[PDB]
Design a protein around this ligand. Structure first.
Ligand code: HEC
Ligand code: HEC
Lengths: 128, 127
């Protein structure tokens, strides 16, 4: 529930910020930049999964301008494309969740690559 | 985690924004502004509980700059005070979490009050 458009914009931005931080902690392990700790990786993946379900709920009508938004007009004019990019992300996060459950480093690394590609694919089309 | 101190600031601000939104949904039910739905209340309480564990991890040394911030210097120069305020909040959130699991309206409402008091108590001294 968002009382003004500014509230939706600040909410989605906030959720993306937290997603990026926790995802990046997992990515650092996967990329061989930090030691691997499966329990910590799982905890951060679980947070990414919970958070991933939030921002894309906050792109309602009239939330396209102001408040520092970087959402492109295509988010609303190509709503089906935006939903497809969101569904691609959700599917990738499902794989990341599965990987966190198994603890399998190779499966985590694969899911990190796939998930990262879903972030970039949506940004390329929908984010300034 | 935080590469730059600005990353900590943006992180804690972001967590607080999400906490306020989801807590506000529970509060609206406690105040009788929205019909009570124990399942939905429990979902929002669960999110508040998860999120509540995040922002207070992002007030490390040197994070009074690197991005715009409303954190008062006392966060760092009255660290015991800030910790007491954080612990009061965590205790209240613990009760909120328990209340969400019972689905008892009265227990949720009481924990909403205690939790909101903890938000305000910290802000009065530190924001
Ligand atoms: C579309 C389906 C997206 C997916 C998948 C991801 N992001 Fe994104 N992001 C998207 C938009 C339209 C915006 C702009 C939001 C606005 O209104 O301004 C963003 C923004 C971000 C940000 C910036 C937050 C800020 O500066 O306040 C970050 C850090 C970010 N996104 C990260 C991110 C990551 C790591 C993702 C995958 C794990 C990801 N996003 C997915 C659209 C979409
Ligand atoms: C101290 C122990 C705090 C408790 C408990 C709560 N908050 Fe707070 N909050 C605190 C600080 C020091 C700041 C400033 C952070 C900064 O670096 O700027 C905040 C900020 C907020 C915000 C604003 C976020 C923004 O505009 O980007 C909100 C919406 C907020 N806090 C809400 C909030 C709620 C609802 C709380 C209880 C459920 C709560 N905070 C607790 C310190 C503390």
């Amino acid at each position: 529930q968002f009382q003004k458009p500014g509230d939706a914009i600040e909410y989605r931005q906030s959720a993306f910020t937290l997603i990026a931080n926790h995802f990046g902690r997992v990515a650092a392990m996967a990329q061989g930049k930090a030691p691997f700790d499966a329990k910590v990786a799982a905890e951060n993946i679980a947070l990414v999964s919970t958070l991933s379900k939030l921002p894309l709920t906050a792109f309602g009508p009239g939330t396209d301008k102001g408040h520092g938004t970087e959402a492109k007009p295509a988010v609303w004019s190509d709503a089906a494309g935006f939903k497809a990019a969101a569904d691609k992300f959700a599917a990738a996060v499902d794989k990341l969740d599965a990987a966190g459950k198994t603890g399998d480093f190779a499966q985590i690394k694969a899911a990190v690559g796939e998930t990262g590609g879903a972030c970039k694919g949506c940004h390329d089309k929908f984010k300034e």
